[PDB]
């Protein structure tokens, strides 16, 4: 019962492709329940900004009545069944899920079909809708890790449409039409980029049965014949610092260029950011944590939480770290958190890559557990990679991964590079770009 | 004796706050002082809610848990 | 590949469950009944800091080996704290799960608490329940547990503000102690054989004595407490007694609960089938939430209404919540909403079993309150046993009987008890 063969065990997931185009994809499971959901390729990215919060606006309106399920009629058999319905829009994918029971699949399909493809867009819900978004951008504009990175898409990405947020701004909401959403529908909602996903109780041929009857002879044509195309966004070094000391604390975030979905490194990427991991002020570890920028910050009292990441769009992306602290530590939290970065450019040994390696192994295992997440990651996979990659090929590519490839990959996308800077609080003693830009390098090495 | 101080005898100074604008000659007997009261600590504001959309879910419906953990941010269930 | 769940009661009365789903992914816990109901007025806030206390030095395990240890094989180690009870739950992979196997053991039940330690750990003690405490419901809870109850289920989860600097090292010794014995305790695996965990079982958790402390009852009082505090939201909670765990009326107030709404199923939705919900949106034009509250306890139950509102308008939500409740309790309901209300239960227990963390924390739960496994085929079809005349008796004894009230907000127009 070895860790290899039980990643060997794991069911394989089965895809088809209907007609029009779009995939069908399934993992079964012995779960009496299911996740079934719709991935569209449609963003903000998608964006020309004039229709800037279109797509959130359109999720915002997808479950308030269709053409054959008019009102509150599709809330009322979608939880006759117990069912659940959520929805969510990133920059680059949209995702419209439903967990039921598995004896209601095909039901929960042709409700998918019912949301995707006819969708009523009633003038007086638009009106209701965009004052509901407006005010819901006022309770967003009150929690500061969401201002922070939407500050470093922002600067990181100027002149591009991966700066703009999924929101949108404001005037937009106002004057949206109904014209130019059923324009952004014709647009983005074509067959060749809708992924079908199901995960749990569900046979994969009474699901591509069931997409046949519903979701076939749907889109696939450009009517003008106006095929969009993705352009590569520009990465910008540069700083935004947005002060305001009447905040109590400060959210700083810091990010280099990353290489995109398709590049492999982020693997290698992954366990870098392992190294450094992650603390939060209610952590039971305190000062014999493994990350030495949390054990130094719990050792001098420095920061309320970080965190790292590695957000990947196509080709390109923000790897990176976010803190929220006090001002007085925010100068010294930069230079600790710079210093790991440089360690792991130049003095990465292979007992911390060994753990990286273990961290990395149990956070994408524990991740992938339960319905919805393994229908997510279907959804994203196809739409990104345009394949399901098996959880025995990334062990294989983590396993791959040492010290030296580590040192490589670290020296290539973190030393002496330009970074983006996002600001927001009490970030006085935030120090310059010129500074920031100083360490990130060594006059050492 | 239509007054607090004629009508509640022991209990004068508990039904009664006095205060001095400007101190007179003669001392007040208990003095007092306050012993350095400790600093509740910094914590980042949470979201207001503005709209019944994002309400929708607050109430409690369950008995309460919390949770702690090594590496795991602490959470509470409701 | 999960083909059984197997099960066995040692004689010293711990309990041992287990299931080989080859899962890559191992987990395994420890129940103990030693939650926050077993402390009296003499040592409130023991069992925050013993839940906190999980990565202190043991007797065979330093807290920097510990910490190391569980970090270098990239597994977690949580404790997971009811009123009730406690669990530790440790997750690992399958190849290195023997050292959470030791270590979880020795952190569970031999614990040296050097004062050092502790006097370091209350300061993390405030810092969490101020966390914890960052948003109103949890403190809306608490205070409707304190009033709604004399002892033995109105202690509090978390530390009083008095009692920190001042839990000492032979207090959380006498409550592991008198409450961290054999005969409280269920160790659950998952991705584990049973021979593995049954030779654990016998070669750490025989030192152990008995049955311990008994408990206190858990009597009820009911009353108000109001914390006028000015915010912009007022939250308000009515409860009343209920059914406890095993009864099968308790059933009968889940499905009343899913009759009145436990919680929205679309992001962003009008609540339709919510009775609650369609009581009191036609009569407000501003923001509110409303739901059902339902929790039961191995000798107690509360059932009541949770609403969220302004504060002009607590009065009308809370009057129109209370008046659909009691419009519930005299007949006027329809049978297929009690069978939508049925199908939302169903659903709902069959998520939260659909996650390994919820299925280890359901099968703990089981194995300490009745002893044993029951399947969830079993449990829904006792879901589809309960009658609709159950879910008026269940209303009419929430009517019927003596409120509780917890209320936090701007309260200038927030009614009183007597005043329902």
Request: aromatic share 8%; with cysteine.
């Amino acid at each position: 019962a070895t860790f290899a063969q039980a990643l060997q065990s794991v069911p394989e997931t089965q895809v088809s492709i209907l007609d029009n185009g779009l995939r069908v994809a399934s993992e079964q499971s012995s779960h009496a329940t299911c996740t079934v959901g719709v991935w569209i390729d449609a963003g903000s990215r998608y964006e020309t900004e004039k229709n800037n919060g279109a797509g959130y606006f359109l999720e915002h309106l997808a479950f308030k009545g269709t053409k054959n399920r008019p009102g509150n009629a599709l809330e009322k058999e979608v939880e006759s069944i117990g069912a659940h319905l959520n929805a969510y829009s990133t920059r680059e994918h949209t995702a419209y899920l439903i967990k039921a029971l598995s004896k209601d699949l095909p039901k929960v399909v042709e409700l998918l079909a019912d949301i995707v493809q006819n969708s009523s867009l009633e003038d007086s819900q638009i009106e209701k809708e965009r004052d509901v978004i407006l005010r819901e951008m006022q309770e967003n504009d009150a929690s500061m890790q969401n201002v922070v990175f939407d500050y470093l898409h922002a600067t990181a990405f100027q002149g591009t449409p991966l700066a703009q947020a999924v929101e949108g701004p404001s005037e937009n909401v106002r004057r949206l039409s109904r014209t130019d959403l059923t324009d952004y529908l014709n647009r983005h909602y074509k067959a060749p980029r809708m992924v079908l996903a199901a995960a749990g109780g569900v046979e994969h041929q009474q699901l591509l049965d069931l997409a046949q009857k519903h979701l076939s002879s749907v889109s696939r044509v450009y009517e003008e014949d106006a095929v969009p195309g993705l352009t590569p966004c520009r990465f910008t070094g540069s700083e935004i610092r947005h002060r305001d000391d009447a905040l109590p604390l400060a959210h700083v975030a810091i990010a280099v260029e990353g290489p995109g979905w398709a590049n492999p490194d982020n693997v290698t990427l992954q366990v870098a950011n392992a190294i450094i991991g992650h603390y939060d002020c209610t952590y039971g570890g305190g000062v014999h944590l493994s990350s030495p920028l949390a054990s130094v910050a719990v050792a001098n009292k420095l920061c309320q939480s970080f965190q790292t990441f590695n957000i990947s769009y196509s080709d390109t992306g923000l790897l990176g770290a976010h803190f929220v602290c006090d001002a007085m530590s925010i100068d010294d939290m930069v230079f600790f958190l710079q210093g790991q970065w440089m360690r792991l450019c130049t003095s990465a040994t292979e007992s911390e890559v060994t753990r990286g390696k273990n961290i990395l192994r149990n956070a994408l295992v524990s991740h992938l557990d339960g319905t919805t997440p393994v229908c997510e990651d279907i959804g994203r996979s196809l739409l990104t990679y345009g394949r399901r990659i098996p959880l025995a090929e990334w062990e294989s590519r983590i396993q791959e991964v040492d010290a030296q490839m580590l040192r490589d990959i670290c020296s290539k996308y973190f030393y002496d590079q330009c970074p983006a800077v996002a600001g927001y609080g009490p970030i006085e003693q935030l120090p310059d770009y010129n500074r920031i830009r100083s360490g990130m390098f060594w006059l050492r090495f | 004796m239509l007054s607090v101080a004629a009508r509640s005898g022991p209990f004068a100074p508990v039904l009664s706050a006095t205060s001095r604008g400007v101190a007179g000659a003669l001392r007040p007997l208990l003095q007092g002082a306050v012993p350095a009261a400790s600093e509740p600590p910094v914590l980042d504001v949470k979201r207001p809610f503005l709209c019944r959309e994002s309400l929708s879910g607050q109430a409690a419906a369950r008995p309460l848990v919390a949770t702690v953990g090594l590496n795991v941010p602490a959470s509470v269930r409701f | 590949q999960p083909q059984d769940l197997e099960f066995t009661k040692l004689p010293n009365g711990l309990v041992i469950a287990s299931l080989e789903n080859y899962a890559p992914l191992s987990r395994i816990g420890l129940f103990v009944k030693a939650g926050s109901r077993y402390e009296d007025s003499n040592n409130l806030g023991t069992s925050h800091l013993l839940r906190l206390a999980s990565s202190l030095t043991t007797k065979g395990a330093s807290s920097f080996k510990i910490t190391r240890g569980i970090e270098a094989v990239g597994g977690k180690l949580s404790v997971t704290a009811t009123r009730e009870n406690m669990a530790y739950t440790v997750e690992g992979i399958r190849s290195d799960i023997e050292i959470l196997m030791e270590f979880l053991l020795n952190v569970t039940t031999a614990p040296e608490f050097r004062r050092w330690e502790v006097a370091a750990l209350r300061s993390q003690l405030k810092i969490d329940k101020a966390v914890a405490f960052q948003n109103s419901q949890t403190r809306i809870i608490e205070n409707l547990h304190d009033v709604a109850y004399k002892n033995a289920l109105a202690n509090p989860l978390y530390c009083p503000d008095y009692r920190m600097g001042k839990i000492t090292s032979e207090e959380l010794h006498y409550f592991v102690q008198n409450h961290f014995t054999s005969a409280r305790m269920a160790l659950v695996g998952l991705g584990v054989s049973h021979s593995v965990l049954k030779q654990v079982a016998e070669q750490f958790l025989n030192m152990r004595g008995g049955l311990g402390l008994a408990g206190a009852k858990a009597k009820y009082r009911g009353g108000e407490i109001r914390e006028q505090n000015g915010d912009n939201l007022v939250h308000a909670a009515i409860v009343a007694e209920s059914a406890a765990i095993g009864n099968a009326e308790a059933n009968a107030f889940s499905v009343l609960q899913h009759l009145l709404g436990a919680g929205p199923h679309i992001k962003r939705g009008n609540n339709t089938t919510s009775l609650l919900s369609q009581s009191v949106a036609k009569g407000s034009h501003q923001p509110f939430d409303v739901s059902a509250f339902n929790a039961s306890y191995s000798d107690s139950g509360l059932f009541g209404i949770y609403t969220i509102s302004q504060a002009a308008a607590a009065g009308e939500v809370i009057n129109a919540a209370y008046n659909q409740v009691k419009a519930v309790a005299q007949g006027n309901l329809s049978s297929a909403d009690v069978q939508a209300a049925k199908n939302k239960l169903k659903a709902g227990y069959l998520m939260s079993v659909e996650t390994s963390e919820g299925f280890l924390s359901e099968i703990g739960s089981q194995a300490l309150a009745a002893g044993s496994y029951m399947p969830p085929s079993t449990v829904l079809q006792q879901i589809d046993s309960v009658a609709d005349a159950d879910v008026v008796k269940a209303a009419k004894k929430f009517v019927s009987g003596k409120k509780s009230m917890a209320a936090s907000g701007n309260l200038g127009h927030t009614p009183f008890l007597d005043e329902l």
